TrEMBL record, chain A:
Nuclease among keywords: no
NCBIfam families: cas5_csm4
Gene Ontology MF terms in the entry: RNA binding
Highest taxon of the lineage: Bacteria
Protein name in the entry: CRISPR system Cms protein Csm4
Start and end residues of each Csm4 C-terminal domain: 185-274
Organism: Lactococcus lactis subsp. lactis
Domain CRISPR type III-associated protein: from-to ranges: 56-169
One of the protein's GO biological processes: defense response to virus
Keywords, alphabetical: Antiviral defense, Plasmid, RNA-binding
Keyword RNA-binding tagged: yes
Assigned protein family: Belongs to the CRISPR-associated Csm4 family.
Cross-referenced InterPro entries: Csm4, Csm4_C, RAMP_III_fam
TrEMBL record, chain B:
Residues noted as binding ATP 1 in the record, renumbered to the chain: S249, G250, V251, Q252, S271, D275, K373, Y566, D571
Lineage summary: Bacteria, Bacillati, Bacillota, Bacilli, Lactobacillales
Family note: Belongs to the CRISPR-associated Cas10/Csm1 family.
Domain of life (superkingdom): Bacteria
UniProt keyword ATP-binding present: yes
Protein name listed in UniProt: CRISPR system single-strand-specific deoxyribonuclease Cas10/Csm1 (subtype III-A)
Residues where Mg(2+) 4 binds: D514, D571
Cofactor field: a divalent metal cation
From TrEMBL, chain C:
GO terms of molecular function: endonuclease activity; hydrolase activity; RNA binding
Organism: Lactococcus lactis subsp. lactis
Record InterPro entries: CRISPR-assoc_RAMP_Csm3 (IPR013412), CRISPR_Csm3_endoribonuclease (IPR052216), RAMP_III_fam (IPR005537)
Gene Ontology BP, a term: defense response to virus
Coiled-coil ranges per UniProt: none
Gene of this entry: csm3
Family statement: Belongs to the CRISPR-associated Csm3 family.
Keyword Glycoprotein: no
Keyword Hydrolase: yes
Name of the protein in question: CRISPR system Cms endoribonuclease Csm3
Keyword tags: Antiviral defense, Endonuclease, Hydrolase, Nuclease, Plasmid, RNA-binding
Domain CRISPR type III-associated protein: start-end pairs: 8-181
Amino acid sequence: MKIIKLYFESPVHFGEKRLSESKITFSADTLFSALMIEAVGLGKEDEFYQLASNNLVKFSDAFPFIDQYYYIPKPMFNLKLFKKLLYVPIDSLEDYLSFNLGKLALSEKVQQHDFKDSEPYNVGTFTFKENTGLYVLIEQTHPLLEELLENLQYSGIGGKRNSGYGKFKFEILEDSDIEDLFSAKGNRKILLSGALPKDAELEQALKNASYLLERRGGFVQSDTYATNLVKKQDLYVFKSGSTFENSFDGDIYQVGKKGNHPVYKYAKSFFLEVS
Amino acid sequence: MDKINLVCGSLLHNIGKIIYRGTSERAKHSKLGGDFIKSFEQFRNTELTDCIRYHHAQEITSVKSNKEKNSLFYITYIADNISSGMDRRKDLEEGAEGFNWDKKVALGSVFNVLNEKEKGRQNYSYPFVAEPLNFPTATQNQYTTSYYDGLITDMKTILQRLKPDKEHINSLLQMMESLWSYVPSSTDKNQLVDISLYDHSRTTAAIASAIYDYFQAENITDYQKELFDYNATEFYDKNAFLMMNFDMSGVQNFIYNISGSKALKSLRARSFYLDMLLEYISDNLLEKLELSRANILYVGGGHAYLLLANTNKTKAILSDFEHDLKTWFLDKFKIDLYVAMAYTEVSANDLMNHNGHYRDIYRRLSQKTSAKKANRYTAEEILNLNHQGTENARECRECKRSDLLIEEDDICEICDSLQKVSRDLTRENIFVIANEGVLDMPFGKKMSALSYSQADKLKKSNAEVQIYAKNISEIGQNLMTRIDMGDYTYRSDFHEMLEEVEVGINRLGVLRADVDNLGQAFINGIPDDYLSISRTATFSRAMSRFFKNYLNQLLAEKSYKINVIYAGGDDLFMIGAWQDILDFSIVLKQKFADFTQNKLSISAGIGMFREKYPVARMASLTGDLEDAAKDYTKNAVTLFDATNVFSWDTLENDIFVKLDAITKNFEKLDETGKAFIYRLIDLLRGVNENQQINIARLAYTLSRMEEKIGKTFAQELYNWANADRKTLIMALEIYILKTRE
Amino acid sequence: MKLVIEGTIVLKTGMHIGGSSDFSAIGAVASPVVRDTLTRLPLIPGSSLKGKMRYLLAKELNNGIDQDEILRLFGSSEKDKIRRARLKFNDIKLSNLAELETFNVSSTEVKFENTINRKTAVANPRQIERVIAGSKFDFEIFYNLDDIKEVEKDFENIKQGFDLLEFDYLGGHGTRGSGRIAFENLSVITAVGNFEKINTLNEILGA
């Protein structure tokens, strides 16, 4: 199982709902949407969507990491039992059965007008400090994914493009001693992506589930989608650090029907199994 | 028999003792109430006052056979016994003419018992006034007959004015909230000298009502056999009570979920609206439960504590209540507002306060909330929300949603509703509910909240609407209840308000604040050994009523140019002139200090802003400014930047005498102010990086002004710059700011 | 394809740029310059560079009448035509701070201005913080290429915008001695893939 570390040269902008906010990570559907926008850029769309349909490029969502420590959100354990804590190391969770990523900011901008008044607007952002960043986790690495990732570091992950925030230089630095945790089978499962199981396996997936729904879905960009900006069908996934017993497996839902090309949303499971 | 018997009996149990020390005659206090109620309230039936006047075994065995059942004199009796807090079963109490009973102790507060390890043991006393401005102070005083004479005129008038019906029970507990919330209950052992007779009485009515529904539930009568064989702990082990909780999740992100033009009136509106919605859903559960406003312990900023009836039918209507409530939420607020209901099933063995089991019972309840707060929705509503979606090109600006968008403009229906009540949310309006209104709240009944001109005529003729208010103007003729809110304004317009202050710099200040150590105060509220149920609710209602009523009155009495948005121990946002909110912070510190009796303190954040500035940016920046002062928890205020964070005593003492000295001296001089002050500031703020250079130039320039600023004054400037110079650079800075133009 | 425009921003005067929401003390500068929130080193937003190039393309292109190329090169969100922005800009940080401390001088100066009332001759002092002249901001611009037939036209009309910015300022109080830039050693190199006719682009940037 593989790592893709992302070292950022610049402040980033990952919004929940609006522009003036930011968060410190970006979910899996954001990464998938970005990568197949780049595959639109180089004409390998359908092959990429089939490669993610056949579950060869299943991947995690992005997580904070500091120098040689990789973190995850605190798993919502439904035990007898810190409320200001957010993340714990992935090799340090079972003992729970020294955190500084950066600082958020509001770089604040204007639109100039010639004769009209100048139009001010503020953009929320977050800055990663020096030996920090983000990383994701994929499964069974693919050369086409390597071909598409290098086109994304030169066109900007993040919200606001092309001016001028989210930018990075990726590096695999393949795993050594963390995929054993993935191979460590356990009695208590931890999701690590914004998954939505299909309707067949949804009701069996709440035997002890301690989840959190999280709305996902925004506007749709293209040169050829719908002749103006339309929303997408908001789809309602579980939050990343959820906790289960019954492992499901979600899928990638088409939420674009009205425009000529479709619009997809990656939501399939990526589990960490512990005691 | 309807529940009016016990609620009008157990709450009016031992009420007539207020004149038992107010006159010289010493008849049996329960019989004293039994004979006064013929002359005080109405032509009251003796069978309805059977539950009043027979409240012990020595007074029940006298009447054991003449007065048969379905009068329920057992019920208020055992409700008294467990509502005191541990045990008063077979003893000649105060009022039964036995000994020289103590008749001169005021109310002992429960601020010390909250965190018994921070104060140990102390007796507190309440200075009462015939609002009222009553504090839990430690200086000891006594209750008087003239207050008892005034309230017995009020008891021969208003209790005569009311009727024992369930429709008007709420008004009499509002009356009791206004009067007997700050009185002692008795002068016995520590169980009933720590609590008011108010929450004792209404919890007594609650215990009586719940055990009445229980005795109806498993169909048990002949109450002599099931109570009087022992101290009844063997009958007290069964599930007869439900210490139930409600909880609002994500209230703060919802009230801040704005990006609008109208971002201040909207913020006030939704901040009020969440508290009002929680109050309405709690009141609906009480009405559907066929209960009163007695068993509701406390409603806060996002949570409610109650007590319930422990029947299978009450559980079934709780299940249907939960389904209706979450269905209403899920088709109005998706996940952004989830409400969590949880009860801890307990016993009256759990309630007699001997076998531990209260703070871990709170912990079990918090677990049962959090176990529900994890597993939110089941399957069908998830699929409903997922397949409900549709694609379009229009969105509201703040509530960024497509559904419930109004026609030909892009604000949500909820969002236009919260701008509709936004402008006309005055200091005096009445919150009426109706089937025709502007707001939306479950179950399918709206809020109008109209002003007191048009909402008066249908408030009686159109019945079956529970009307809420924020003025004590219901003497018993209007059937409105009061629930206050922080709503002080100067005139809610900054352009007129800031041009009034033609003294200092034309700048607008805002304020953010909260209360220190409040989270630990609710992790472990009151311990086991000194517990009755009713006492910890009085703390939170005193804090909340302190904030709303006291802050509104405080900003009224000293005519401050301060507009108010929030109110609470976690939310406080006021906007105004900086010269008026800077000196409001110190008196806020003093008033919350002597209200808490120097136990709970304030973290505050104050910043200075241009008059033409987006208020959302102001509120975010000053909340973060306070959050810089919040962790510093400790008591502290930051002044306009994260670099200037001062503790309260440091602020008050150090700066406000090193501003008073500067103002006192430099206004005596016609040729020093204020180029010398600017030069002194410039050399003082730059000593942080290079030190002996600036201190030497400072000594030289204090020497050369020593004939003008004073042979004394330069010495204090030198030693203050050596000793505490961060508290003088801010002192000269705020002197400069308040001596502008 | 996807191309990288590389170079630097050698600064001839000024560059007061931006403005933060920090509380303006009485003291030192009110309305300070924009700096990074961690490292506190002066940088320009890439949006201001992007907007000056967009503006100076806009005022000169189709001089007499928005246009295609002002959306072909810089994005659009109209109700009929929506185009992906062909350029790609990043925020540009200060580069040569090591040799801007060999002169033992700070990165950012404070500039002392005032107006006088014409009516009463009462001055009104302001301090404005701006980066010192002689700064060099090493910048990188990427290029979202999607058609080979327009690379030479795009590059001749961005190099035209590259020189038109040298005669205008970049942000802040421009018409009172600020913001004037110059562009040294501009070049182009393909990010990924391999383009063939990079020579004409590299010479037209070096021209």
